[PDB]
Every structure is written in structure tokens, then in C-alpha cells.
């Protein structure tokens, strides 16, 4: 089974099991989008570098999302401990 | 800023300190995957070798992103339920 | 301020609005208990009839105070446990 | 069984079951204390009124303690709901 995605004005026929089609298609869409932004600036010159840079930003995006989530959890933990102290001091 | 080596080319990205090791690990993946694809000869052109590799890591990351989001909304619910029980106990 | 009638004498106390009915209920108890004790003849002297009645309601209140405190520390613990489980779920 | 408490410089022999001795003794102690404060001011003249006034304040003390506790619970409930909203908006 072949999936044919379009990434940055070029075509790719990838042997993909029906199982992963949607996943691969959105991954391609996501990569395409990120490559379009990068290309539409000028810092990166070279179609191969654009792709590599995109993969690195996508990697950053996800690492940062996890960092933000971890911070969000830790914070509510601090607030929960603040609640606990209020409870111990008066009730 | 971090400077990584991917398939005989240098890339310099602005990564917040705590991401360095993960980004390096990413680059290492990229480089390896590109050499593998290049060696297969199934994809012609450095730009195409680059996106096939980039598509590969993006697909990987989104899968990890899902499992993350799974665990994430899961604890968001246990926490919501617990706080709810706290409210009720206080009424 | 509230003005109550207890065993043919008026008392005026400064009660925060929400207590009026409960304080009136208290006075009603006092008056009834004093008439009962006075009628028994077992206690001689209005001052002694007064404290025996006052001791009676005080004893009553402390019992209610205990049951209150019981329920109170009980929910203070369920709440503490729940918040604790919330903290753990967030780690 | 007779318990002999002292309340405001006078003695009282009360038929009290061993079961309630401690309770009755602290109630007497509590009443005595409250009657001493009241007498040591001047607003109330008359040993019987002093006792009645004391029972009313003791009643107030307890009504107010319960009001304060209810307020304390309601408040932590508001804070818990504030926590819940934080959770729903980001996590």
C-alpha cells in the first residue's frame, strides 16, 4: 500500500500500512507547514537544510510543550500544598 | 544556541539549555536515518533524502506526542475527580 | 442586641443577627429548666437555681461541642487525604 | 454518686453518674470561669443574672465557633474550585 503525500511542492510515495495512513499524512502536513515557515524567511538556504531545520524545530516544539506541561503540573502541586497548609492551620 | 552535525553539515539552533541533550539525540537520529536512506538508493536527491528522514522523525515524535497526551489527560481526570471529592466533603 | 425573657427577668445581649433564633431557643431552655429546678425545691436560692440551670445547659452544649468537633476533624482528615492523593497524582 | 463542684465561691453536690463526672467537672469549670469574667466588670448585678448571662455567652461562644468553622470550610471550597478552574484551563 502506497500513500502519496506532498511535502514542499514535491511528491512522495511511501509504502505505508493502512494502519499508519492518517498518522503519516498529518505528520507530512505538519512537516510541510514547518518547512514552509522556515523557507519563507531566508535564514536557511538549501532544500535539504530546510527539511533538517524543520525536524529540529518540530523536535523543539514538542520538547517545549512537555517542559511547559511539567511546569504547569509542578505549579498546581505548589498550590495544592498551599491548600494543605491552610487546612492544617485551621479546621 | 546549539551546533549539531547532521550528515556532514552543521546546523546551529537556539535551544533552551534543558533541551540540548534531547536535540543532540534528535540530530543523531536524523544523521543515521539519512545515511540509511541514502544507502538504500530508493530516494534520489539530498533534499528528498532530508525530508524522508525529517518525515520519519516527525512521525515518530507525533506517536510519542500521542502517548504523552494520553497520560496527560489521564492524570488531569484523576486530579479533577479528587478535587471534586474534596469539594463535596466540604459541603 | 437581643432581649430575652428568662424566669421573669429580662436580659439584653449583643448577638450577631444569625444567632438570634438559637439564643432565643437557649433562653427558652434556661427558663424552663429553672422553673423545673425551682419547682423541685431541691435547690434553694435564685442564684443557685440559676447556676444549676446554667451548669445544665453548659453541660449540654459541651456534649454537642464534642460531637461537632468529632465530625469536624473527621472531614478535616478526608480532605487532607484527598489533597494528598492529588499531590501524588501530580508528581 | 455525688460530684461536688465549686462554682463562683459556692458548692454544689450533684448526683452524677461516674460516666459524666469529667464532663460535668469541666462544664462547671467553664461556667465558673465565664461567671468570674462577667462578675469582674459590673454590667451585671445579681448572682442569678450573672449565671444566666454566662450561659448566654457560653451559648454565643459555641454558636460563633460553629459560624467561623462554617466560613472556614466555605472559603477553602472556593479555593478548591479556583484550583479546579486552573486545571480545566491548562493541563
Curated annotation (Swiss-Prot), chains A, D:
GO BP field: division septum assembly; FtsZ-dependent cytokinesis; septin ring assembly
Coiled coil ranges (UniProt) are 62-90
Question: Gene Ontology terms, cellular component aspect?
Answer: cell division site; cell septum; cytosol
Enumerate the Gene3D superfamilies for this protein. Answer: 1.20.5.50, Cell division protein ZapA protomer, N-terminal domain (3.30.160.880)
- Which Pfam families does the UniProt record give? ZapA (PF05164)
Q: Which UniProt keywords apply?
A: Cell cycle, Cell division, Coiled coil, Cytoplasm, Septation
| Protein's cellular compartments | Cytoplasm
Q: Subunit notes for this chain? A: Homodimer. Interacts with FtsZ.
The UniProt function text for this chain reads: Activator of cell division through the inhibition of FtsZ GTPase activity, therefore promoting FtsZ assembly into bundles of protofilaments necessary for the formation of the division Z ring. It is recruited early at mid-cell but it is not essential for cell division.
Q: Which family does it belong to?
A: Belongs to the ZapA family. Type 1 subfamily.
Q: What's the name of the protein?
A: Cell division protein ZapA
Organism, scientific name: Pseudomonas aeruginosa (strain ATCC 15692 / DSM 22644 / CIP 104116 / JCM 14847 / LMG 12228 / 1C / PRS 101 / PAO1)
Curated annotation (Swiss-Prot), chains B, C:
Instruction: Tell me, in one coarse class, where this protein mainly resides.
Output: cytoplasm
InterPro entries of this UniProt entry?
A: Cell_div_ZapA-like, Cell_div_ZapA-like_sf, Cell_div_ZapA_N
Q: Does the keyword Transcription regulation apply?
A: no
Q: Which UniProt keywords apply?
A: Cell cycle, Cell division, Coiled coil, Cytoplasm, Septation
Where along the sequence do coiled-coil regions lie? 61-89
What subunit structure does UniProt give?
Answer: Homodimer. Interacts with FtsZ.
Report the protein's function: Activator of cell division through the inhibition of FtsZ GTPase activity, therefore promoting FtsZ assembly into bundles of protofilaments necessary for the formation of the division Z ring. It is recruited early at mid-cell but it is not essential for cell division.
What protein family does this chain belong to? Belongs to the ZapA family. Type 1 subfamily.
Any idea what this protein is called?
Cell division protein ZapA
Q: Which organism is it from?
A: Pseudomonas aeruginosa (strain ATCC 15692 / DSM 22644 / CIP 104116 / JCM 14847 / LMG 12228 / 1C / PRS 101 / PAO1)
Amino acid at each position: 500500500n502506497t500513500l502519496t503525500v506532498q511535502i514542499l511542492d514535491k511528491e512522495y510515495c511511501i509504502n505505508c500500512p493502512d494502519d499508519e495512513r492518517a498518522n503519516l499524512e498529518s505528520a507530512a502536513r505538519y512537516l510541510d507547514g514547518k518547512m514552509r515557515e522556515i523557507r519563507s524567511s531566508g535564514k536557511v538556504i538549501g532544500a535539504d537544510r530546510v527539511a533538517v531545520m524543520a525536524a529540529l524545530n518540530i523536535t523543539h516544539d514538542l520538547l517545549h510543550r512537555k517542559e511547559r506541561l511539567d511546569q504547569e503540573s509542578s505549579s498546581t502541586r505548589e498550590r495544592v500544598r498551599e491548600l494543605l497548609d491552610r487546612v492544617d492551620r485551621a479546621l
